[PDB]
Amino acid sequence: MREYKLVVLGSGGVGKSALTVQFVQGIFVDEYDPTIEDSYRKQVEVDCQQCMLEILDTAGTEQFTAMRDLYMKNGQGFALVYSITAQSTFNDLQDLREQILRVKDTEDVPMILVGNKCDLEDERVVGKEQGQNLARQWCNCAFLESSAKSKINVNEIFYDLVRQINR
Amino acid sequence: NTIRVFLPNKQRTVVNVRNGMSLHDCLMKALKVRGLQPECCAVFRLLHEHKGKKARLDWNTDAASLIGEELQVDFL
Numbered sequence: 519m520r521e522y523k524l525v526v527l528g529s530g531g532v533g534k535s536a537l538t539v540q541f542v543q544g545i546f547v548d549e550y551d552p553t554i555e556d557s558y559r560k561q562v563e564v565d566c567q568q569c570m571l572e573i574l575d576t577a578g579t580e581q582f583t584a585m586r587d588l589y590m591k592n593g594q595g596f597a598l599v600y601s602i603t604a605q606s607t608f609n610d611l612q613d614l615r616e617q618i619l620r621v622k623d624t625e626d627v628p629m630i631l632v633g634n635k636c637d638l639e640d641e642r643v644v645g646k647e648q649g650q651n652l653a654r655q656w657c658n659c660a661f662l663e664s665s666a667k668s669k670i671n672v673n674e675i676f677y678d679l680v681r682q683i684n685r
Numbered sequence: 686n687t688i689r690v691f692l693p694n695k696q697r698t699v700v701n702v703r704n705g706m707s708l709h710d711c712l713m714k715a716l717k718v719r720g721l722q723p724e725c726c727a728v729f730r731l732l733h734e735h736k737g738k739k740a741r742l743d744w745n746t747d748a749a750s751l752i753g754e755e756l757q758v759d760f761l
């Protein structure tokens with residue numbers, strides 16, 4: 519079956535791992551255990567088709583970032599995640615999107631902007647239109663707000679990337 | 686204080702080793718989130734000196750003794 523290489527990017531503590539393991543294992547990771555290096559693979563069914571998904575979960579907090587360029591070179595689709603409870607994580611994404619375009623050398627790369635922790639509405643410091651308005655600037659890229667905890671739009675992040683790659 | 690582990694289905698993880706952990710304790714969470722059960726797998730130490738050989742390890746091995754070693758988990 520066909521393989522899809524996805525990379526989950528974003529700053530520390532935004533929920534990259536929580537979204538990933540909720541997607542592959544249906545487990546909610548409550549603890550904050552900073553990632554060093556982790557890759558997951560799971561056979562799924564997207565639009566009546568069985569396919570292999572490779573998901574590289576990156577370290578939001580690392581000292582050496584030389585490998586990021588290589589992860590971007592080999593990935594087919596990218597999920598840029600921020601947390602709606604921390605403004606700096608949202609601000610940090612513009613650099614990641616610019617770096618990806620630079621490495622792929624095209625403005626048309628499968629991508630989805632994800633605002634995680636949407637279940638913490640009372641703690642929101644990044645508005646939804648603020649998030650939607652950033653995605654429109656990035657050539658109208660996909661955008662959604664999720665929650666690894668409540669299971670809101672978790673599967674959607676990954677299926678959408680598979681769908682953009684299929685076009 | 687880490688160990689890189691190659692897992693089945695072309696997966697990989699780098700785990701932190703806290704003094705006192707057995708090989709089973711440090712890989713527990715990484716295996717669980719991928720639905721892998723240690724009792725159905727063998728774990729090896731990759732021998733780089735002997736071009737491609739692996740040397741099987743006990744799941745109860747002291748993990749701190751393996752810092753710097755690259756490992757491989759396979760199914761039985």
Ligand SMILES: Nc1nc2c(ncn2[C@@H]2O[C@H](COP(=O)(O)OP(=O)(O)NP(=O)(O)O)[C@@H](O)[C@H]2O)c(=O)[nH]1
Pocket residue numbers: 528529530531532533534535536537547548549550551552553554576577578579634635636637638664665666667668
């Ligand atoms: N309430 C709420 N908490 C969340 C959500 N997603 C993740 N968390 C919590 O936020 C913390 C950080 O999540 P984690 O997945 O570890 O983040 P990360 O982006 O992978 N961190 P790092 O880059 O260091 O690896 C964890 O305690 C996790 O349970 C969410 O949608 N809702």
Ligand SMILES: [Ca+2]
Pocket residue numbers: 753754755
């Ligand atoms: Ca080594």
Ligand SMILES: [Mg+2]
Pocket residue numbers: 534535536551552553575576577578
């Ligand atoms: Mg993580």
